[PDB]
Amino acid sequence: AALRGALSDRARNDRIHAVTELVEGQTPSTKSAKTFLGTLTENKKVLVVIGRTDEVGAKSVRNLPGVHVISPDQLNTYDVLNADDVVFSVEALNAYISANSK
Amino acid sequence: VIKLHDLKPAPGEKKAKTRVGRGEGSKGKTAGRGTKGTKARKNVPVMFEGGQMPIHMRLPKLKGFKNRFRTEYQVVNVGDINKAFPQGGTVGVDELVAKGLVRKNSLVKVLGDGKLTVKVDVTANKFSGSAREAITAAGGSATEL
Amino acid sequence: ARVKRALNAQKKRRTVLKASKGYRGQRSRLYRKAKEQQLHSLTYAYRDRRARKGEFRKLWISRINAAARANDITYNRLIQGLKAAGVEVDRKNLAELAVSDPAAFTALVDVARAALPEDVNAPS
Amino acid sequence: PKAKTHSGASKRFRRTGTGKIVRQKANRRHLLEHKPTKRTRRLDGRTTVSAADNSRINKLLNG
RNA sequence: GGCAGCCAACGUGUUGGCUGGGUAGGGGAGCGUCCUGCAUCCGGUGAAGCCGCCGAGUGAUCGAGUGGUGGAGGGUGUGG
RNA sequence: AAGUCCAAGAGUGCGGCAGUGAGACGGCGGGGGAUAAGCUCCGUGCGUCGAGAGGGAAACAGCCCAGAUCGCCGGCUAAG
RNA sequence: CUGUGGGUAGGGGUGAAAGGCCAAUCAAACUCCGUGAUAGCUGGUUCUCCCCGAAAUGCAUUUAGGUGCAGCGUCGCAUG
RNA sequence: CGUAGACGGUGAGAGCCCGGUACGUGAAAACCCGACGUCUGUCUUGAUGGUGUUCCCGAGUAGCAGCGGGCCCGUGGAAUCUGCUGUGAAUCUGCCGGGACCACCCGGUAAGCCUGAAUACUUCCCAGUGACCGAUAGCGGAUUAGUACCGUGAGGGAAUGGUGAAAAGUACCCCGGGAGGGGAGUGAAAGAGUACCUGAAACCGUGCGCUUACAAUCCGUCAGAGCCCUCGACGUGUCGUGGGGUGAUGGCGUGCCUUUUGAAGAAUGAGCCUGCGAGUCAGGGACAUGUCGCGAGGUUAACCCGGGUGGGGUAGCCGCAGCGAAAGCGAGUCUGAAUAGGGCGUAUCCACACAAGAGUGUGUGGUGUAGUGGUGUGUUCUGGACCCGAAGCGGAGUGA
Ligand SMILES: [Mg+2]
Ligand SMILES: [Mg+2]
Ligand SMILES: [Mg+2]
Ligand SMILES: [Mg+2]
Ligand SMILES: [Mg+2]
Ligand SMILES: [Mg+2]
Ligand SMILES: [Mg+2]
Ligand SMILES: [Mg+2]
Ligand SMILES: [Mg+2]
Ligand SMILES: [Mg+2]
Ligand SMILES: [Mg+2]
Ligand SMILES: [Mg+2]
Ligand SMILES: [Mg+2]
Ligand SMILES: [Mg+2]
Ligand SMILES: [Mg+2]
Ligand SMILES: [Mg+2]
Ligand SMILES: [Mg+2]
Ligand SMILES: [Mg+2]
Ligand SMILES: [Mg+2]
Ligand SMILES: [Mg+2]
Ligand SMILES: [Mg+2]
Ligand SMILES: [Mg+2]
Ligand SMILES: [Mg+2]
Ligand SMILES: [Mg+2]
Ligand SMILES: [Mg+2]
Ligand SMILES: [Mg+2]
Ligand SMILES: [Mg+2]
Ligand SMILES: [Mg+2]
Ligand SMILES: [Mg+2]
Ligand SMILES: [Mg+2]
Ligand SMILES: [Mg+2]
Ligand SMILES: [Mg+2]
Ligand SMILES: [Mg+2]
Ligand SMILES: [Mg+2]
Ligand SMILES: [Mg+2]
Ligand SMILES: [Mg+2]
Ligand SMILES: [Mg+2]
Ligand SMILES: [Mg+2]
Ligand SMILES: [Mg+2]
Ligand SMILES: [Mg+2]
Ligand SMILES: [Mg+2]
Ligand SMILES: [Mg+2]
Ligand SMILES: [Mg+2]
Ligand SMILES: [Mg+2]
Ligand SMILES: [Mg+2]
Ligand SMILES: [Mg+2]
Ligand SMILES: [Mg+2]
Ligand SMILES: [Mg+2]
Ligand SMILES: [Mg+2]
Ligand SMILES: [Mg+2]
Ligand SMILES: [Mg+2]
Ligand SMILES: [Mg+2]
Ligand SMILES: [Mg+2]
Ligand SMILES: [Mg+2]
Ligand SMILES: [Mg+2]
Ligand SMILES: [Mg+2]
Ligand SMILES: [Mg+2]
Ligand SMILES: [Mg+2]
Ligand SMILES: [Mg+2]
């Protein structure tokens, strides 16, 4: 219930975003991810929720200062409330919705 | 947007601890223990009564024995069966467990306390007499396994 | 979390020792000895603020009595006569008249003496 | 560690359906010849523990 | 003339009545210290500490008020 | 039956947390003692001290007056 | 009488016997460990303010300077 | 720039200056883990019935007895297991277990042996972490530390960290035998000089202001003359809504703590300062009381899967029916011969009948019953359990 409360607070303030990929292809690039995240949110702290397999997305955002990366099965109240914005991979968002709402 | 610094405990949730022996403005010096005696430095056992034959020794032991082989039953009243099965139907032990009327692995006896208005086919380990009457009189069956 | 005591501890010491400036010997120099004297000093001060009101009244009464007797009336009959005349000047100012304006005090004595009963030692 | 229940107290006191603590009475074990039946009857059965003793007995039963 | 506790009376916190010595002891509400989550701010144009000045609060105490000394960290808010 | 009744901060019942279980003197009613003790042991909806500052008693826990919320260089009284 | 070398070890030694002496310690040595031995006993127990506020009695006690229960305090709930 | 914003260093807060970091890459030799061979074993006739007073199936053994040990079990009605001492069987109709024992059923096949994994631990080596310590702390040990030193011996057992960015550590001159200092230099600073960062207090000096040699002082307090200093307005000093220092003289005034009926007490403790030194922690523990989640349900334990604080896990536990010694019965039940009277129980209330004024009860209807799991606080339980302190009691050693 605490996690749902935190995610609902972001959703009501339109702080939840969904994306197909952080970067295109199989080569990590921090420059691409930084530009793309800049288009999504200008806030400092961002929680990025990615599936286990998306190594290239995780590596691409890892080095950015305010960005925190988590898998959707590890989603927790502290990291949601610490972030200004939550960015979901579509696969990770669907995985979270499925494991809960089913 | 709610942030970590917005998280507060509920009003009255947290109470400050008492810190004794921290000055005469609070519980200082003797820390609430008064002065001298056994209690100034240790606690007195609850069983102890000063030497007088304690209550737990001057009273007789309760009579009787406990039967190691006792079969105890989980019980359901028919009045609960009414609320749990308004439509009636077949009610076995599995149905009673699913409905929260009994614990899951237990022996079930059915008892007569409530009024039965619904036709029910009840399967349980045992029935009281009044349970027999109420089940049958509403047009249902009482089978004991 | 080991906490060192000096930072918190020194504050009360500085307060007490500042308050004990001008004391003699150990009472000005040592916190423990100055603390002891501070207990007495503030007790004395509280007690003497109460007593001060009586002490000043005592002074005023003595000065009024001297001026009254220089005008051939005792203090007790002066106070009686001023009450009978309805003069509500208190003793602080009566003493200030006795010192700073003997003429005004003399006029008050005449008023008081006129309002006195004819036979002060008579019933009623 | 788990709190241990007092063995002797748990053999001498019982709880009723509503949580009242009950006990048996002393003076009914022997020397019965001189005791009138009215006395032995008064001493028979169980009785609610006195309010003064309730708190200590609760502590002994609970641990 | 100021403060406080209990209660009343109404109001979107003020008015009134009564009360406020206190050891053992019970209850309530706070000050100062350190380490931390989060958020903010100050600092070689001089942080802390220390010595003063001038002031402040009902108390523990305070000074993001200021001089001197000093040389690298510190404050504030809300939680742990 | 009334009084008190913006409260005595009263009784009664249950529960959390106690402390205390060495008392002192003074008045009145008594035992022990020699109708001695600043003696000792009881009674007293008796007092004070204990845990009570202030005034009186030269000084003087237990007597007389009076129960200190803080301030005043106002006034009236208590015992004396 | 004395040098050198040697022997007897803790409830044990040695003693022309004093409970003497056994490394300045002996009615049971010393050291480490059990061990932070246990003391109904003595001492100590650290910032603040606000409200209330005792007891030194009864009963029992291998008990009488200890403790249990009651009495008397406080906080909460209930009953007014 | 970033697959690198780990952490350090560098003359003060460095992703881009340095060691690094992400990420890649590398082993002659030795060692370790495999795979594959050689090599070594082993097997190669198996299925299928019948048959029987036939033979075998772990002997000083089982059993039994005495005295013990250990099991929830302290000798108990005492089984099972086990030591010592006696006595001493059966080979399957056998024998041993199913809490004395017997019968009947059931389970098993003693007196031969071996056996991986799940579990326990870390002298030592490698890589890391901390709402851990930061020099009276943390190891006894940041400094020659089990050292100095103490003891015949076993054994006991300390104290001592910081110049500066860089030693640039003060050439040379002056006083002095040196020590030390004064000039002059170095340095951002010597208010950093190997006695060195900051540099508190006790304690010890020098200078200035007021005061004090006719006085009886818990050392202060409240009044207060005189003098000194300072801030305002005015003028030569004088007054104010003043502020400081000192203080002649007057009133009042019996330290603090502990412990006591009562202590300034000629009762106890404290020479002084600085630093240190006492209700803490663990457990689905116990009772109570806040708070939060869910709610007739609440919740998981171990464990499993995530570099996490997340997900999963139903075994349990606590509520849900009581009464009774128990068999048992059940909104009732126990006692009893009672359809007697009581005990305990049927959440709590409301209305209506029917009996009672012997305390009100008995029936119908309605209304519905609150628990449990986190976590704060108080008390409590088992542990050192708020802290300090014996004389003494054991075990093992050291000493003539
Ligand atoms: Mg805690
Ligand atoms: Mg106290
Ligand atoms: Mg103290
Ligand atoms: Mg004490
Ligand atoms: Mg005592
Ligand atoms: Mg006590
Ligand atoms: Mg115990
Ligand atoms: Mg007065
Ligand atoms: Mg009998
Ligand atoms: Mg009989
Ligand atoms: Mg008011
Ligand atoms: Mg008070
Ligand atoms: Mg008062
Ligand atoms: Mg108190
Ligand atoms: Mg501070
Ligand atoms: Mg500079
Ligand atoms: Mg700091
Ligand atoms: Mg806090
Ligand atoms: Mg006693
Ligand atoms: Mg007594
Ligand atoms: Mg008495
Ligand atoms: Mg006497
Ligand atoms: Mg009194
Ligand atoms: Mg008095
Ligand atoms: Mg008068
Ligand atoms: Mg009079
Ligand atoms: Mg020899
Ligand atoms: Mg002798
Ligand atoms: Mg000797
Ligand atoms: Mg001995
Ligand atoms: Mg032990
Ligand atoms: Mg001890
Ligand atoms: Mg009071
Ligand atoms: Mg006895
Ligand atoms: Mg008691
Ligand atoms: Mg860094
Ligand atoms: Mg065999
Ligand atoms: Mg045994
Ligand atoms: Mg057998
Ligand atoms: Mg083996
Ligand atoms: Mg230091
Ligand atoms: Mg050390
Ligand atoms: Mg020795
Ligand atoms: Mg030596
Ligand atoms: Mg400097
Ligand atoms: Mg030095
Ligand atoms: Mg220095
Ligand atoms: Mg003179
Ligand atoms: Mg005199
Ligand atoms: Mg005097
Ligand atoms: Mg005495
Ligand atoms: Mg006392
Ligand atoms: Mg003394
Ligand atoms: Mg003395
Ligand atoms: Mg003594
Ligand atoms: Mg002394
Ligand atoms: Mg002995
Ligand atoms: Mg010994
Ligand atoms: Mg030897």
Swiss-Prot record, chain A:
Highest taxon of the lineage: Bacteria
A biological-process GO annotation: translation
One GO CC term on file: ribosome
Keyword Transmembrane: no
Alphabetic keyword roster: Ribonucleoprotein, Ribosomal protein, RNA-binding, rRNA-binding
Family per record: Belongs to the universal ribosomal protein uL4 family.
Quaternary structure annotation from Swiss-Prot or TrEMBL: Part of the 50S ribosomal subunit.
This protein's name: Large ribosomal subunit protein uL4
Organism of provenance: Mycolicibacterium smegmatis (strain ATCC 700084 / mc(2)155)
Classification lineage: Bacteria, Bacillati, Actinomycetota, Actinomycetes, Mycobacteriales
From Swiss-Prot, chain C:
GO molecular function ontology, one term from the record: structural constituent of ribosome
Entries under InterPro entries matching the protein: Ribosomal_bL20, RIBOSOMAL_L20_CS, Ribosomal_protein_bL20_C
One Gene Ontology term from the biological process aspect of the record: translation
Pfam family, one: Ribosomal_L20
Role noted for this protein: Binds directly to 23S ribosomal RNA and is necessary for the in vitro assembly process of the 50S ribosomal subunit. It is not involved in the protein synthesizing functions of that subunit.
Classification via PANTHER family: 39S RIBOSOMAL PROTEIN L20 (PTHR10986)
Family: Belongs to the bacterial ribosomal protein bL20 family.
Name of the protein this chain belongs to: Large ribosomal subunit protein bL20
Source species: Mycolicibacterium smegmatis (strain ATCC 700084 / mc(2)155)
Swiss-Prot record, chain D:
UniProt KW Ribonucleoprotein keyword: yes
Coiled coil: none
Ribosomal protein among keywords: yes
Gene behind this protein: rpmI
Regions of compositional bias (Basic residues) in chain numbering: 1-41
InterPro entries the record matches: Ribosomal_bL35, Ribosomal_bL35-like, Ribosomal_bL35_CS, Ribosomal_bL35_sf
Alphabetical list of Gene3D superfamilies matching this protein: 4.10.410.60
HAMAP family given in the database record: Ribosomal_bL35
Record's protein name: Large ribosomal subunit protein bL35
A Gene Ontology biological process term: translation
Protein family (similarity comment): Belongs to the bacterial ribosomal protein bL35 family.
NCBIfam families: rpmI_bact
Region called Disordered, residue ranges: 1-63
Superkingdom classification of source: Bacteria
